[PDB]
Design a protein around this ligand. Sequence first.
Ligand SMILES: Nc1ncnc2c1ncn2[C@@H]1O[C@H](COP(=O)(O)OP(=O)(O)OC[C@H]2O[C@@H]([n+]3cccc(C(=O)O)c3)[C@H](O)[C@@H]2O)[C@@H](O)[C@H]1O
Ligand SMILES: Nc1ncnc2c1ncn2[C@@H]1O[C@H](COP(=O)(O)OP(=O)(O)OC[C@H]2O[C@@H]([n+]3cccc(C(=O)O)c3)[C@H](O)[C@@H]2O)[C@@H](O)[C@H]1O
Ligand SMILES: Nc1ncnc2c1ncn2[C@@H]1O[C@H](COP(=O)(O)OP(=O)(O)OC[C@H]2O[C@@H]([n+]3cccc(C(=O)O)c3)[C@H](O)[C@@H]2O)[C@@H](O)[C@H]1O
Ligand SMILES: Nc1ncnc2c1ncn2[C@@H]1O[C@H](COP(=O)(O)OP(=O)(O)OC[C@H]2O[C@@H]([n+]3cccc(C(=O)O)c3)[C@H](O)[C@@H]2O)[C@@H](O)[C@H]1O
Ligand SMILES: Nc1ncnc2c1ncn2[C@@H]1O[C@H](COP(=O)(O)OP(=O)(O)OC[C@H]2O[C@@H]([n+]3cccc(C(=O)O)c3)[C@H](O)[C@@H]2O)[C@@H](O)[C@H]1O
Ligand SMILES: Nc1ncnc2c1ncn2[C@@H]1O[C@H](COP(=O)(O)OP(=O)(O)OC[C@H]2O[C@@H]([n+]3cccc(C(=O)O)c3)[C@H](O)[C@@H]2O)[C@@H](O)[C@H]1O
Ligand SMILES: Nc1ncnc2c1ncn2[C@@H]1O[C@H](COP(=O)(O)OP(=O)(O)OC[C@H]2O[C@@H]([n+]3cccc(C(=O)O)c3)[C@H](O)[C@@H]2O)[C@@H](O)[C@H]1O
Ligand SMILES: Nc1ncnc2c1ncn2[C@@H]1O[C@H](COP(=O)(O)OP(=O)(O)OC[C@H]2O[C@@H]([n+]3cccc(C(=O)O)c3)[C@H](O)[C@@H]2O)[C@@H](O)[C@H]1O
Ligand SMILES: [Mg+2]
Ligand SMILES: [Mg+2]
Ligand SMILES: [Mg+2]
Ligand SMILES: [Mg+2]
Ligand SMILES: [Mg+2]
Ligand SMILES: [Mg+2]
Ligand SMILES: [Mg+2]
Ligand SMILES: [Mg+2]
Ligand SMILES: [Mg+2]
Ligand SMILES: [Mg+2]
Ligand SMILES: [Mg+2]
Ligand SMILES: [Mg+2]
Lengths: 201, 203, 201, 203, 201, 203, 201, 203
Amino acid sequence: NGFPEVIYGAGKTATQIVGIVQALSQQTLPILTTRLSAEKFAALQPALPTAVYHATAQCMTVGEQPAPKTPGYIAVVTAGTADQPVAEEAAVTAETFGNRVERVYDVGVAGIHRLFAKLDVIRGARVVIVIAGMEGALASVVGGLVDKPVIAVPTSVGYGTSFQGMTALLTMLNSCASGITVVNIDNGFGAAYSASMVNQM
Amino acid sequence: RRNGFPEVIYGAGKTATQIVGIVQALSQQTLPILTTRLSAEKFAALQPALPTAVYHATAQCMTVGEQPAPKTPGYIAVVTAGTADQPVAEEAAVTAETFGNRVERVYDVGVAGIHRLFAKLDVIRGARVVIVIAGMEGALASVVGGLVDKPVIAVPTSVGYGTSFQGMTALLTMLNSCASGITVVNIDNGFGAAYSASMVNQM
Amino acid sequence: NGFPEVIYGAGKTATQIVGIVQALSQQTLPILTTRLSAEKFAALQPALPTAVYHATAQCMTVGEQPAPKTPGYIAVVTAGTADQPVAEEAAVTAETFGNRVERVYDVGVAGIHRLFAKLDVIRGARVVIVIAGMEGALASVVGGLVDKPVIAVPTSVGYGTSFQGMTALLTMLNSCASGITVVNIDNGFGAAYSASMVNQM
Amino acid sequence: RRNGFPEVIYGAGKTATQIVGIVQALSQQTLPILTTRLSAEKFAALQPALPTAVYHATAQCMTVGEQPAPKTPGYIAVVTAGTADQPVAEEAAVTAETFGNRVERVYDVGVAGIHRLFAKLDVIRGARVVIVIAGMEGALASVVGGLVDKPVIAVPTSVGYGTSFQGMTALLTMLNSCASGITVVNIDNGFGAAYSASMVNQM
Amino acid sequence: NGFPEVIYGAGKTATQIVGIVQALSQQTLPILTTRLSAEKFAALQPALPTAVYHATAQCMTVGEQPAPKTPGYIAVVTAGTADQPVAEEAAVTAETFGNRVERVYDVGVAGIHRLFAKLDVIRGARVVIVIAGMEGALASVVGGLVDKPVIAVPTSVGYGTSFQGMTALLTMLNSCASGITVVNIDNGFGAAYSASMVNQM
Amino acid sequence: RRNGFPEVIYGAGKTATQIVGIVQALSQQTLPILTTRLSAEKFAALQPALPTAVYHATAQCMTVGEQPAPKTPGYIAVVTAGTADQPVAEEAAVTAETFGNRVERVYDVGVAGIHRLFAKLDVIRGARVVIVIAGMEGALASVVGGLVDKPVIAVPTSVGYGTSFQGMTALLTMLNSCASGITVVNIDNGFGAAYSASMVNQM
Amino acid sequence: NGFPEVIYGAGKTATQIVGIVQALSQQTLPILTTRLSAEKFAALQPALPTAVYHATAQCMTVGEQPAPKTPGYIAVVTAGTADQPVAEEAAVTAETFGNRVERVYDVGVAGIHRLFAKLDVIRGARVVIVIAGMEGALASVVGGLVDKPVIAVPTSVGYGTSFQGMTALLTMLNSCASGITVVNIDNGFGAAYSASMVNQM
Amino acid sequence: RRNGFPEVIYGAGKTATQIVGIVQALSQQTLPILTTRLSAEKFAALQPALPTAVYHATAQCMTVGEQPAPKTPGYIAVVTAGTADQPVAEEAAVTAETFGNRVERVYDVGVAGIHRLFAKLDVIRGARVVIVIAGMEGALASVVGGLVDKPVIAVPTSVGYGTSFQGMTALLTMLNSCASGITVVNIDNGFGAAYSASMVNQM
Ligand SMILES: Nc1ncnc2c1ncn2[C@@H]1O[C@H](COP(=O)(O)OP(=O)(O)OC[C@H]2O[C@@H]([n+]3cccc(C(=O)O)c3)[C@H](O)[C@@H]2O)[C@@H](O)[C@H]1O
Ligand SMILES: Nc1ncnc2c1ncn2[C@@H]1O[C@H](COP(=O)(O)OP(=O)(O)OC[C@H]2O[C@@H]([n+]3cccc(C(=O)O)c3)[C@H](O)[C@@H]2O)[C@@H](O)[C@H]1O
Ligand SMILES: Nc1ncnc2c1ncn2[C@@H]1O[C@H](COP(=O)(O)OP(=O)(O)OC[C@H]2O[C@@H]([n+]3cccc(C(=O)O)c3)[C@H](O)[C@@H]2O)[C@@H](O)[C@H]1O
Ligand SMILES: Nc1ncnc2c1ncn2[C@@H]1O[C@H](COP(=O)(O)OP(=O)(O)OC[C@H]2O[C@@H]([n+]3cccc(C(=O)O)c3)[C@H](O)[C@@H]2O)[C@@H](O)[C@H]1O
Ligand SMILES: Nc1ncnc2c1ncn2[C@@H]1O[C@H](COP(=O)(O)OP(=O)(O)OC[C@H]2O[C@@H]([n+]3cccc(C(=O)O)c3)[C@H](O)[C@@H]2O)[C@@H](O)[C@H]1O
Ligand SMILES: Nc1ncnc2c1ncn2[C@@H]1O[C@H](COP(=O)(O)OP(=O)(O)OC[C@H]2O[C@@H]([n+]3cccc(C(=O)O)c3)[C@H](O)[C@@H]2O)[C@@H](O)[C@H]1O
Ligand SMILES: Nc1ncnc2c1ncn2[C@@H]1O[C@H](COP(=O)(O)OP(=O)(O)OC[C@H]2O[C@@H]([n+]3cccc(C(=O)O)c3)[C@H](O)[C@@H]2O)[C@@H](O)[C@H]1O
Ligand SMILES: Nc1ncnc2c1ncn2[C@@H]1O[C@H](COP(=O)(O)OP(=O)(O)OC[C@H]2O[C@@H]([n+]3cccc(C(=O)O)c3)[C@H](O)[C@@H]2O)[C@@H](O)[C@H]1O
Ligand SMILES: [Mg+2]
Ligand SMILES: [Mg+2]
Ligand SMILES: [Mg+2]
Ligand SMILES: [Mg+2]
Ligand SMILES: [Mg+2]
Ligand SMILES: [Mg+2]
Ligand SMILES: [Mg+2]
Ligand SMILES: [Mg+2]
Ligand SMILES: [Mg+2]
Ligand SMILES: [Mg+2]
Ligand SMILES: [Mg+2]
Ligand SMILES: [Mg+2]
């Protein structure tokens, strides 16, 4: 293994979270808490002063991460700014797992030139995580322009025929470019977990 | 007619011997007569019956009467994602040409090789209307829409296996494009798009 | 091109909106802000005094529109009053793009005589935008009575088997009348954007 | 019977040799015997077996015994959207006539040409019950419902390709009509409508 | 025709409602207002003192109904008490249209003996309206025990696989008993409208 | 075996020559050997190959070896809504009998004629487990469940046209019953129900 | 029969509940009230002092349960802690029906060793109730490891492709292991009702 | 190529005489040439045409040119739930071997008999990437994912009747796994998984 300790933040209370963190207090292992609301990080902030909270990602990391474990990096590519929350959930979990992360945000195919401008970075990552909602055309465009494993995270942003991520998920599952592999809606952590395993072979 | 255009005949309910009778009921006093979604077999059935009729095999459409030459200088670009889309692409391309519009075919420029789309980007941008035909994911419409300033009509096709859902995924992707300038028709409806593209191009 | 500046109003805050408007302050180009709530237009109204807000459409236009750019007009036809919000979103975006707009509201096929009464206007537009929800029979009736491009906007009004616009969308996609072409639910802007391109050839 | 009406026989599970046996089990001591959704082939299979039986090919229904003449002065209007709806239209029209009701057929008056519907509007308004049969979008029910003051029964049919969803879209459109006076049956269920229309007309 | 004036109560405000009622003040024709909330009937109750409000049905009737127009009656049969709101919407609209109404409530097939106990009444109506949700087995049981037109109203009560009435609607559409004819979810008015037309031939 | 019961063989992936080989791989040192969902043709294919094998045509199941006589005094009631349900009814009835349970068949007692259900209500109430098999609407489970104090297992079948959705509507209706005592299996899964009913009855 | 009195707690008010309990006051028969909110148990707690409330299960039992009616027991096995509410609804209803209940909670296949650790108990029950959501793989794993009737309850926990229990329900309906039999989402009572009938033959 | 790998050919749109022409268009100046989803009949059609071509019947794939021996010491584990998954398992196993990866096949270890999965657990854990292929419920991915520390790619297959929904239920189950390390592809897409597994293993 060699992964840190992860805490899910949805069904657990701010108290329950502190109790799990104090149980894993020894060893100086990094602890990640995902999907942790801002209000559920207010109550416990007096409890853990040495903890950091990534507001957009709703993730909280207590304990110093040492260096990256590999020189390579993972690129987190997003289609629109509405994707940045699950994107930062992915990028923060990857960085906590000891990965260098290069964020290429808001490069949707509506403005396709923006994506080509950052292609040198995207093509040089060991893994690419593409995060998009609405219509997941970005996963397919990037998938056909890189030669590295791509993990697609569809996002639940959007009303109507967006279906809170279903259309994006179906698009990514139908991606023409082979080598795209998909995770569940908003699962920015699960992508970074699989991406971290690939990067850190 | 309340829409001054050629005569159209469904083909999803009509038999071979019926097609001759339905065509002959509106034959002389009309423009060309077009028949869509007509089986590939019922053109041998009527080739002696309708000797002056033509059949476009891939398009599954039959045109009786002389096809009008382009009544307009502009052209309509029919852009296809993969070769599997050519049946509905040719239904659109034959429908457009029958209504008197020039067509420029840009086939198999799917987003997997975006470079291929850029190589033919000059022709696509030069059309007055663009018909983008795709399936599986249907991302080409979104990509083309954001690269052209002319009206785009997106046709999802039922091509594809698995979660393709016989065109539903492509239709949903196209309806949910962020690039504006995109209007959508029903799955495999290459005719309906060429019908609208013809009105835009005619104007 | 020759279109004005558009601002989406959903994910942006009233502050962020003013900052985008002040960045595009020079040139005297019209600026349109769509899907802009009444509460998100209260906060910024001291900021932009010269801006107008179309309450029903939730659209805000700062800067004087010059004349129409074409003598032709676009007809915005609605089935019921419940469709007027996305209708005005369409009509305001079209008028901001420099189109003359003729509004033919509340002519659903339940009272089909009302639609025939205004057919002289609908038939004389260069483009028709038909907006309906519940059951999109109006797009098909109008489509078969006009000889001009029709763009159908299904609306999300309604509960139960209305499916928040899905049934209307499917009906319009199955419209018997050829020449109907459909946009996404509530996308009054997208229809007016495509309609404006057609009208202003 | 708890519903004083003729004998009905499904045909979706029955074989040819079975249809003779099922009909003969309730033959003399009954009204006419009707069989719905019976294959177009298993009427040659039984035409010598049941020589006094009739078959309506388009309707896929077989009636043994003398059909009753209209026991009522009113009639039932069976209004169809396109010719593709005639199979379920005739299932409704043959079911209605077998129960002893006059039928006036108004076929192929879809909303694409609303003028056609108005030309036959006098006959439709004159019925005691109206059966509107349509598919694809299914807008005729809504249009007719708002133009008639008699009860309308709407039958969606599975006609149509693509997002037609084999009658689901039509069914949804009809259930979500704003014009009141409309009640709906299941897809392709031309019998169930004529069954209800017969009770209304009989009254 | 010969039906009263109907007012929909959903998209109209309590003020707008009073203005429509005062416009139809003359003739002494009954006016029905359906789907009219309790809070939207508080505000207008000083406006129309002579109006009655049926709380469960969310319907408001101003103006005296004269006698029934036919000796026959319509039976409103419900499966469970959760169906009573749309049931009373149906029964009140039918009674306002000049129909005698016999309410046979809470006779779901779970306790099938209760339904047989009231069968003498149900079988003697000119029309039967069966209202049920969850699983619409009651429409089919009654349909096969009566020889009169049945109109089925599926109701939106229930979570999970109830699908807010979809399962009930599909069951009723698949009713084995012929002569069932179905309306849209919760459309207690539409059933009573069609039932009233049948009863009052 | 971790579930002391006879040997079961899918039939949805197996060929005729394969069925003999799969049966012979677990033949002598076993209880009877049962094969479900096996084509009606691949029993002529093996009738000389497996001369001691029996085939129940309607059930599409083949049993090799002597069937055990009821090892219990109670019986399992297999209640069917219409004759169209007998294929999956017999899959359940043959599976139950192979496991050594008595079966009482109550076929075609759909809720359309509730009187028919009451006429055979004594036999149904007398079973230790009741299997209710229905489709289209699937109301019988709810009706039977509220009339019996023994455990009921409901099997939806894909019988039916239109909005029947090939068993989905029946499955949904049964899962959403108000009468308690009802547990549901997957569409057409007459085996899975008889498998559970056998364990309840055995106990 | 021989089952206690059950009261549904969803559509009934705290007052209506006390009135039903006082009507069934005589005989000293246990009374179970399911799906009874904490706020709907506050109001009535002065009314019934001798009643107990199972907070997690939202169930209230008034009246002393005598001994179990059978030496056998029913095992309630859950995949994650998020399943414990409907699990306790099942376990409390079973115990009120006179069954011994052995709770094997939070043994999802993610940590499959935990399930094998408690297999000796699960295999010795007369009936097994398996409760899971998200992906119902636990019903299938247990079903293939026991030789006793299993009743699967899918739970509605989860967003996105969880579909508020639909995916779990479909998985359990497709369980490879025969002998699984399924109930409706969250129907912890219905499983315990059928399980109690089996256990108490 | 922008992805340095062998030549791939769809087979869902291509005819026999077409496959020879499409292969010959990119034949000498390439790595091996692979064709997926190619009918089991159009290999007799081309076996004299392409005498140096091989066909894997179960996989429905044809490889022209010499297959590369493992260019890596690690292997890819292709784990199958039931024998009904072997067609898409072999599409994955043949795709992986063509790209130059060792494959260890672990077939028919469904969760019904978890003991079978543990007996081959050493081989599965020893792979650099694991491809888990399943249908019906698709629980194996979740079970395997929680027992291995290497990346798992889950392939749902359309195997199964009833509410299996032709792979939708399996796909949904796999996407909604709690065990992390699992990434999913589209239904029956054994190629797409072996394509990604090959890149991971190559690294
Ligand atoms: N078995 C298989 N399953 C899934 N994908 C497979 C595949 N074999 C090749 N592929 C890959 O599919 C891609 C294209 O298919 P190819 O064999 O060339 O075939 P082609 O005829 O180009 O594409 C056929 C279908 O692909 C759809 N597509 C492809 C690419 C882009 C988009 C879009 O609209 O943006 C849509 C398109 O709508 C059409 O219906 C290639 O990258 C190829 O490697
Ligand atoms: N009301 C409206 N309806 C439809 N389209 C509208 C629109 N307003 C702007 N747009 C257009 O859509 C774009 C959306 O951006 P904005 O609304 O500012 O919002 P932004 O945060 O940039 O993106 C919102 C969502 O769009 C998705 N997206 C965008 C672009 C391409 C792709 C892809 O994967 O290929 C996906 C992305 O996943 C994200 O969840 C705008 O740049 C504009 O061109
Ligand atoms: N390939 C094609 N795809 C889509 N539409 C096509 C078409 N070819 C002609 N059309 C157009 O279809 C229309 C009618 O079809 P036609 O070929 O005449 O054929 P027709 O038999 O009149 O219509 C067949 C189907 O159309 C449905 N429809 C049509 C019109 C109105 C409504 C309604 O219920 O209100 C329903 C109707 O339910 C029936 O199932 C014409 O305007 C024609 O131009
Ligand atoms: N409870 C009820 N359930 C079902 N139908 C009911 C109803 N109350 C009135 N109605 C009837 O439905 C009509 C709806 O109008 P109202 O409720 O006042 O409301 P209104 O705002 O006029 O329309 C509401 C919705 O109806 C849709 N509509 C109406 C008419 C035809 C079409 C079409 O496209 O063909 C669509 C329209 O898209 C809009 O979103 C009423 O005029 C009345 O005849
Ligand atoms: N074409 C047609 N479309 C729709 N319904 C039709 C019909 N022809 C007869 N019917 C009516 O169908 C009813 C029964 O069908 P029949 O022809 O006798 O045939 P039968 O074999 O009894 O029923 C076949 C199917 O009916 C389903 N059904 C029927 C009754 C009750 C329920 C239930 O579970 O409670 C289910 C049952 O699940 C089975 O799959 C009769 O009342 C008959 O008048
Ligand atoms: N938690 C639970 N989950 C599942 N079933 C449960 C239950 N609690 C009681 N039940 C049982 O279900 C019944 C529901 O009644 P209750 O919860 O008190 O509620 P009630 O208001 O009587 O009925 C609620 C809903 O049940 C529908 N229903 C009931 C009976 C039969 C039919 C039909 O059309 O055939 C439909 C009816 O349409 C209504 O919308 C109870 O009498 C009880 O036997
Ligand atoms: N007719 C029938 N309907 C339903 N289930 C039936 C059955 N006949 C046997 N079974 C049972 O099915 C089970 C396996 O099928 P078998 O006949 O051995 O056949 P097998 O080839 O092992 O399985 C075929 C299918 O089962 C699926 N499955 C099975 C077990 C576990 C999982 C998983 O992914 O975890 C999936 C798998 O995805 C594959 O597509 C056995 O326990 C057997 O008793
Ligand atoms: N954000 C995330 N997205 C996806 N997976 C995530 C995750 N965070 C943790 N996980 C993983 O998923 C597990 C879920 O547990 P946790 O979030 O703490 O929550 P917990 O309450 O243990 O379980 C939550 C839900 O998981 C379902 N579940 C869990 C395990 C297996 C099965 C089964 O039936 O086979 C089902 C169970 O039915 C319950 O409703 C964690 O132990 C962790 O390994
Ligand atoms: Mg943006
Ligand atoms: Mg290609
Ligand atoms: Mg554009
Ligand atoms: Mg109105
Ligand atoms: Mg027509
Ligand atoms: Mg009317
Ligand atoms: Mg009750
Ligand atoms: Mg029957
Ligand atoms: Mg019971
Ligand atoms: Mg946990
Ligand atoms: Mg197996
Ligand atoms: Mg893992």
